[PDB]
Amino acid sequence: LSDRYQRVKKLGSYGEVLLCKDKTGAERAIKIIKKSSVTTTSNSGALLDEVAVLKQLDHPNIMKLYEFFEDKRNYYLVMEVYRGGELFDEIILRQKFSEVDAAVIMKQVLSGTTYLHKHNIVHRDLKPENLLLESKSDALIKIVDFGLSAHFERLGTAYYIAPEVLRKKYDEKCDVWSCGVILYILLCGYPPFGGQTDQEILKRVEKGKFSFDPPDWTQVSDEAKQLVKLMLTYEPSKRISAEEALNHPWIVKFCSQK
Fold it and tell me: What is the C-alpha separation between 14 and 32, in angstroms, rounded?
């Protein structure tokens, strides 16, 4: 655990993420997951089988997984380096994003999500914290923590959860909903389903009602509102896929420079 890698700095806080050097001399981001902090939802042979698949994943908008270690105390996930923090940080800094910058981000989020769905992987926990920036530039958005929801709350996860997950009957479409909530936040600076406590947030999510209220939504393009509506459609069967969202006029418009 401590013999193989040398800590450079802490990156984030499932558990803690550290920037480490290989004592190869490449730099890696290592997630330390404490056994006590998580409740297991699968058997011992199911996680190792998924790891074998997660190591094979190769996409510009998906965190590469190199190694998976175990001891009596922790799970160790050795990933590629990231130096630009999380999207969550940028949301605090910028408050709201321009439609061009939001589309650039969302194209990447949807590209990665589409790729994950093509291999029967649903994230279920998509949020700005799980959307990482490669560097401090141009920098690629990379999805992290995929494939973990199938094996293992006060971190504001209620905002992004699809109503079907609450009904305990979900598929890949729950990721599109989460992506819609993220997009909504990027455009105006606040969640579509808010509240002071998790309980009143989840009730608004269950109701499914949201608004494009002034003055924050007034100048937002019509195709942006159209996409948010399609991603936040209550019926998951009627909800557009990640690929459809990626191909939507709003993405196509603002990512071809309009």
Answer: 8
- Resolved by: X-ray
Q: Resolution (in Å) of the shown entry?
A: 2.2
Q: Are residues 28 and 81 in contact, defined by beta-carbon separation less than 8 angstroms?
A: yes
Q: Which of 3, 101, 125, 175 is catalytic?
A: 125
CATH of domain 85-258: 1.10.510.10
Give dist(CA 179, CA 86) in Å, integer: 15
Do the annotations mark residue 64 as ligand-binding? no
Contact 57, 64 (CB under 8 A): yes
Hey, is 85 helix, strand or coil? Answer: coil
The residue extents of the domains of the chain are 1-84, 85-258
Q: C-alpha angle with apex 38: 32 to 42, nearest 5 degrees?
A: 110
The answer as to CATH 3.90.1150.10 being correct for domain 1-84 is: no
125 is catalytic: yes
